[PDB]
């Protein structure tokens, strides 16, 4: 369906993020049968929203729980909301939600990183209290967007396994809200900026609408009406403009009016005049040779999970700004939109990514019981549904982020195994369909190191080359000397194979803060520094390398294992954001360069 | 040959483990070509002996060197040593060592952990100064104990790889010494102590002499002559005795005299009167069921590597005494004899082990594909020669340690892969040889967990079942509930399969000192505590379990990889001997039991 980011004019919101809700586990899965949502959850306790449920209670049994949990809370609908449109919206519900307003089932959602909403006017009465009950599921299976497998034990209980690193946080991770609309209402919008050698340029509106006529007006930074359009379906305004750029990120505001003889609906959609596409081995934003810096990130932090948080947000960006990141990627799931609004506002370049992670079964590291399906693409394991579920996941992200100028690229998935058979048959359609959803931006699929330049059957189908590489770490462990060869050899081997522009979307080594070594070896701070030094030395000797993003901005939490010391320790910063000695090395390189500019194959 | 430990009676040492020697690498392998023993080493820096060489200089390139190194040093023969048998002895040179006295090659030994000595009188002049060059080699191959594979890259640069955890430290790890005897001298002794429901018994004695009549007397603790003996290679002495006992290890002293017509020799051998035997599922010391507590340990510490050190020894023994440990295993190689004299004197029970770890090609870390012989027991890999070099390692160990009453059993190997056929072919004759070499102690071979009760092909050939188990950590990771079911089922399978006594000789988890967690998950101090505790509950349920040796006394250096965060962290103590909180857990369990005695299945 249609997603529009709420803002506040002929519409206003009660955020329900007001944190404390009633909470409970349903270890018997008797909750739907016993119709829990008709009265107050019993045996509950306070929980905060937004945040993951897992770590709020310091309890392993809750942390590793799998199945359904219940959220409940009450809330007076504002008196002024008349006969108006009342709309309940969740920015995310991690993995799956079902919603009961008093007794009315109003909503259902699968996907954990994108919004869903419903018109609730008929079971609500403005000026009165209404119960809100949410049922939340955190289970993953094969047609799910990260896939996974729930093993039920003989003894009654579930237990989740899956194929990615990062830990399976679940819950209401983002803002909920009740919001208000006129019965005339904008409900969809799309916008495209074309650029021309940097002198002048044009933007297209298209806009689905609740019944009404659209006056479309584009405003200055200073609110001077410099673009006007008529029509409820389409326009193009060719004004000679001020562009969205990386150092600075200028933005226009396109108000959107939908009219009836009774009503009016007014919408400001921030807009960045920017063009994105690839030319040969170059990446082009406003027809310029960019160079990417920054990291893969996660939504992870002590206590809250992947739960959204303003302070955290403000601090991390301060940190990225300081250290010279111009860009980052939404590692392995759609992030809360606020990050993107900030990126636009601040001109930060974003490779936007779907939750399609862990399609891979070789990854890995198993001393344990094998199964585990034999064929990756099978009706058993990655199947028809799964391509369809996956398709739907790509719609939504694009539905949400097409209008965010900061997004210069889409990412279809991260590290799928492309050595098994259906791997090109699975990936070709979605690659086509992606561009049929948005042809304004290039599209990639992020590449695991064992589908290497001679074995990977999928890369031509995409526009840019996104590599995750560990050459001294998982292989050649500890050996910078031979690691540098393999890496360059393999970067050159990609350059000729595909003659595409190359970005390393993951390069990094586990490092324990405070571990220091005169022998400069694995897990030491010094080693991280030497290893990043080297990867760097090597992108300076390759023309096709136009992007660099460090494995992890900060240490995050993982599934429990032998290869993870209390989590992934590959952060430049610790989880509480204290900088490892490598923050200061990246500091120099990233602020020493010219903005958006590769070195002189040296410096 | 014959090995007796030098002491000071007619006999006299000049230590010369005075440790400042000259030192250098040989990178182009010129050393034997250019007869370096002939002239004082060039480009030679000072190094401490005893010590491992790898860590004294804070240089990665020296630390990771593979090849040949040289130790050189001048000494003074005491003028007093006039008519004298002058012997040059090395307590260990790690892996192989070749020795020159001033352009006269006197020795060569392969093995890194037991002594070799030469009668050098004719190449030295009492009261003059000599130059001593040692060429030490640290490489491993399929015939070395332990085995390994040096890999030479395309450049001729050698790189050692091996199949055990701990770091290949090399160098002169133990004292060197010149020592003296008369030309009539005892050069081998053997003692067997017998006992019968404990009121009084005998000690058979076998004595090999260099040119003399032998006589023999048994002196008391307070030095009074409790019995007497005459004859050369045969005697037996009877006694009403204070047995050597795990708590306290009472010691008589046997006094050996070799008499010529002219010359005289005197050798004191400490004797502990005690019997050791398996009876069914029990391990009997002086006819009483005993229960082992304590550690597998390593020879490792900062800076010195495996270099022996007195302060370190006294400190670790205060720690083990404090914590309630009554025993250990010389994990992985023979330890400094000093370690066994200590045991003898304080009544510590020891499991003495060869350096034959690494027989297995199946404990790989992941995914560096290559490449290792596909058949473990094959002419390419573990072959007739290997079995010889292994038999030799057994001989040398027993020759050294046979009179140590603290040694109660011999372990022949640690974690060989016993699945491949011919495992049994390879070990049966070693088992047999070992018993013949010393008929007085039970024998074992430490068992790796993926050779399990149903797959192992070797354990019926040995007397005591020693198991290295990691359920909850390498397998069932993090899951105590299910680790515990699997541990118990497996221990019961072994009891029913073999009806031998079971000692768990490794159980432990990596624990980063200072990582604390409410979730009690994998790398935290709390997990280390809960995991050992679960293991303990199960041991107390299984009647064949007769001992527990926690895997690591202290953290230790390993080769680099993704599984070892700067070493093995299964320490109870850190490498600098600081206690982790599991230290106090073990302390309570071990000092709270009745000494030497299995709990009652209960707290
Ligand atoms: C199931 O969730 C988990 C749990 C714990 C660790 C991981 N690891 C992950 S995601 N990575 C991918 C790094 O971008 C490490 C990894 C690399 C790797 C490389 C090669 C060349 C091979 C042959 C096998 C490999 N196996 C691996 O595991 C995943
Ligand atoms: C630095 O030296 C290195 C280098 C690389 C790896 C290691 N790992 C080591 S020593 N172990 C200790 C085993 O007692 C972990 C281990 C457990 C294991 C368990 C099962 C059940 C199976 C089937 C396979 C397994 N493989 C393993 O490797 C050590």
Swiss-Prot record, chains A, B:
Pfam family, one: Glyco_hydro_2_C
Entry GO MF terms: beta-glucuronidase activity; carbohydrate binding; identical protein binding
Secretion signal span: none
Disulfide-bond pairs as recorded: none
Protein name per Swiss-Prot or TrEMBL: Beta-glucuronidase
Record EC number: 3.2.1.31
PROSITE patterns: GLYCOSYL_HYDROL_F2_1, GLYCOSYL_HYDROL_F2_2
The species this protein was found in: Escherichia coli (strain K12)
GO cellular component, as recorded: cytosol; protein-containing complex
Top-rank taxon, per record: Bacteria
Record's function text: Displays beta-glucuronidase activity with the artificial substrate p-nitrophenyl-beta-D-glucuronide (PNPG) and with 4-methylumbelliferyl-glucuronide. Is likely capable of scavenging glucuronate from a range of chemically distinct xenobiotic and endobiotic glucuronides present in the gastrointestinal (GI) tract, to be able to utilize these diverse sources of carbon. As part of the GI microbiome, this enzyme is able to reactivate glucuronide drug conjugates, such reactivated compounds can significantly damage the GI tract.
Keyword terms of this UniProt record: Glycosidase, Hydrolase
Gene responsible for this protein: uidA
């Amino acid at each position: 369906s249609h997603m529009l980011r709420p803002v506040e004019t002929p519409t206003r919101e009660i955020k329900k993020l007001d944190g404390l809700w009633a909470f409970s586990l349903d270890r018997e899965n008797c909750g739907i049968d016993q119709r829990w949502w008709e009265s107050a959850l019993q045996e509950s306790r306070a929980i905060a929203v937004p945040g993951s449920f897992n770590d709020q209670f310091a309890d392993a049994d809750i942390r590793n729980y799998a199945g359904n949990v219940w959220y409940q809370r009450e809330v007076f609908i504002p008196k002024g909301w008349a006969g108006q449109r009342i709309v309940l919206r969740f920015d995310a519900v991690t993995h799956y939600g079902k919603v009961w307003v008093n007794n009315q089932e109003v909503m259902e959602h699968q996907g954990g990183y994108t919004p869903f909403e419903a018109d609730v006017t008929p079971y609500v009465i403005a000026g009165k209290s209404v119960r809100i009950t949410v049922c939340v599921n955190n289970e993953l299976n094969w047609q799910t967007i990260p896939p996974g497998m729930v093993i039920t034990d003989e003894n009654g209980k579930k237990k989740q396994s899956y194929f990615h690193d990062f830990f399976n946080y679940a819950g209401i991770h983002r803002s909920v809200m009740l919001y208000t609309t006129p019965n005339t209402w904008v409900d969809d919008i799309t916008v495209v900026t074309h650029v021309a050698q940097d002198c002048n340029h044009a933007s297209v509106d298209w806009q689905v609408v609740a019944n009404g006529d659209v006056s479309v007006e584009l405003r200055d930074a200073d609110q001077q009406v410099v673009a006007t359009g008529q029509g409820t379906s389409g326009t193009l305004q060719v004004v000679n403009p001020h562009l969205w750029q990386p150092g600075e990120g200028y933005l226009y505001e396109l108000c959107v009016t939908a009219k009836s003889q009774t009503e009016c609906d007014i919408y400001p959609l921030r807009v960045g005049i920017r063009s994105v596409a690839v030319k040969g081995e170059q990446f082009l934003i406003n027809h310029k040779p960019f160079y990417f810096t920054g990291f893969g990130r996660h939504e992870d932090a002590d206590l809250r999970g992947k739960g959204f948080d303003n302070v955290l947000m403000v601090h991390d960006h301060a940190l990225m700004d300081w250290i010279g990141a111009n860009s980052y990627r939404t590692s392995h799931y759609p992030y809360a939109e606020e990050m993107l609004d900030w990126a636009d506002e601040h001109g930060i370049v974003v490779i936007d990514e779907t939750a399609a992670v862990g399609f891979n079964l070789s990854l890995g590291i198993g001393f344990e019981a094998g199964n585990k399906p034999k064929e990756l693409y099978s009706e058993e394991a990655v199947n028809g549904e799964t391509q369809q579920a996956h398709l739907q996941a790509i719609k939504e992200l694009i539905a949400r982020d097409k209008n965010h100028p900061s997004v210069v690229m889409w990412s279809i998935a991260n590290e799928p195994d492309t050595r098994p058979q259906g791997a090109r048959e699975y990936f070709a359609p979605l690659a086509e369909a992606t561009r049929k959803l948005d042809p304004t931006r290039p599209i990639t699929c992020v590449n695991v190191m064992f589908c290497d330049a001679h074995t990977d059957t999928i890369s031509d189908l995409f526009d840019v080359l996104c590599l995750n590489r560990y050459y001294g770490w998982y292989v050649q462990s500890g050996d910078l000397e031979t690691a540098e060869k393999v890496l360059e050899k393999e970067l050159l081997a990609w350059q000729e194979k595909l003659h595409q522009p190359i970005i390393i979307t993951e390069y990094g080594v586990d490092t324990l803060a405070g571990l220091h070594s005169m022998y400069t070896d694995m897990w030491s701070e010094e080693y991280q520094c030497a290893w990043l030094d080297m990867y760097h030395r090597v992108f300076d000797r390759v023309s096709a390398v136009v992007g660099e993003q460090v494995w992890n901005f900060a240490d995050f939490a993982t599934s429990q294992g032998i290869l993870r010391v209390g989590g992934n320790k590959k952060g430049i910063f610790t989880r509480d954001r204290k900088p490892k000695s490598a923050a200061f090395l990246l500091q120099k390189r990233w602020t020493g360069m010219n903005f958006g500019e590769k070195p002189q194959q040296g410096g």
